[PDB]
Amino acid sequence: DSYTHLSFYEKRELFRKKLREIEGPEVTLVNEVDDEPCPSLDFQFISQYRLTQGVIPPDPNFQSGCNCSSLGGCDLNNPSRCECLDDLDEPTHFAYDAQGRVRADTGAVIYECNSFCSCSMECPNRVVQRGRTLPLEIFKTKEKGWGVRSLRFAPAGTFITCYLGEVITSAEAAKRTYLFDLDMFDEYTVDAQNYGDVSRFFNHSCSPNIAIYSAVRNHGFRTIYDLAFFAIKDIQPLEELTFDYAGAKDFSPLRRQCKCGSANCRGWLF
Template identity: 30%
Template sequence: MNLDADQDRDMELGQEEAKAKAQSRKKGNGKRKVRETRRFVSFPHVFILTIHREFGSISALFFSLSRLQLLSLAWTKAAAQTGAAPITFVNEVDDEDGPPDLGFNSNSREDEFTYLEAKPRTFLKELLNPPDADMFLRCNCGEESDQDSDVDMEKSCGVSSACGCQGISELVDRYKKPARAYTEDGLFKFASRSKSGIEVIECNQYCNCTLYECSNRVAQRPRSVPIEIFKTEALTERASRSSKRGWGARCTAQVVKRGTVLGSYTGEIVYRQTANLLQGNHGTYVFDLDGKDPAEDNEELNENVQIYSIDARKCGNWTRFLNHSCLPNLAVYSAVWDTIPEQNIPHLVFFALEDIPKGAEMTVDYHAGIPLPREGRIHIHRPPDTNKCFCGAKRCRGWV
């Protein structure tokens, strides 16, 4: 018997078996990577570049992603470029693969949508260039205190009367004295329905204070609350398909405290007369920048003063999904920091009117200036060109 030959043969068999096991492990790792990839991409903070770096080519991966996942990835990545929290899309109601007209479902350029987290865009010539620096009021908050002054300059942004850029602010407290808009924790102090629509003058780029240390730079900070865009359900069994509210917005990660600033409405700034000509669904996402009805515009504004609206049909952010309620949990105020009030293009900022529980839909009153019925659902006179309201509020106008 040749023992050496037998040992050599056993070694060869052992090596082949080891190779087979190694190949099996590689295949297993490949399957595990696919499973992990599918799990990872369901979370919005994993961006396309991260997936590419970890797993190589992503072309095959994208074919396995749903449109909801693609929208979540794209919107979260765009929001993250400004430092804002993630945005996810979910549908627990039916098989619709996401809101229409947002891309990822056709090759048509008509389907393209541009996400604008923090700032609207415009193609109007008079708005393309910012105002000259000398047109802005500015403060010296943050400079060393003057020994002869009773005001601590490091904290004077929190004292409206001491902050130089607040000279044109009309905010006052209950004693009619100049007031600041925010608490030290960054909550909007005028969080009530009666105060909706006021204008806040925030510190600007020419002020000496900094973004995160200044208590008067809240609306211009990145959004810290994660948002979920979700498919809503009809509020009543009798509600027809046309009465469903489509897609809405909520936060499932945390309770949203009363006074929390959530972000501003973005889109394309257009002339008011242009917005008024939009018909049907083309006018669905228009928000007037001065918050006034045309009748008020005619009475209060000079014919030579241009007024504007924001159209979020082809570009905008998550706020375009805020549905109407006659008794909402959000409201809007105007804020100015990168323009001057005379330009009539303030930021429209959303804030929480009350503590909003996790998972509760965020809503806003589309007609905040119109009175509600005093008691119950006694519908007030319905204007022409309005739709029946299905908000379900205890005090509902009956139309929207």
């Protein structure tokens, strides 16, 4: 295949070295199950979408901000008047509560503030934007390959990370698993095989503990938005992070049965 000249030790140290180059809280590597040293060594970690030819990026002439200024950004207690929330229904509220966690009544769409807005980067409505906050750990699972788990307790509503990768068209997808359509608002797709984030290793579960929230900050066509993972159950340290691929991430582009321990596992094929 490749990287045959590198020993088990050499491979593991180079991946751990790649992880330390990531910005933000630490990301660690662990394997107590078998002898695979690490995931692919040519994989590249990124912090924002990598666009490809064919992708029409957003037009900044459609961008709108909000007037709030104040002392420390927008005010959770005055959800009205903040223009970023106008798209919401009559009892308008920010997606986030006082603790910084997504609210229980929040829908599938989170409207955040932009660079056009007048609020600072400490605005309460820039949670997804400020990025990951939990230390994560890539580890080898028993029957699912690699997976991710948290080292700190993550109550429900805690932001975890975003799904990143190459943004590509249907055509580019045809020429070429890991495909994650941007189908919330109705042809761009996210391919995380060569470029992506830690979330590239999140495994599937039929009773998951994290879910996807479509975070929108652009006021143009909603062809590109953030795929934000939030906890929907409480997550104890070392608990594997899993979400429901169905409707979101593809199971395939002679299969393999699902191996989640849920008592209601429906039994998908990969």
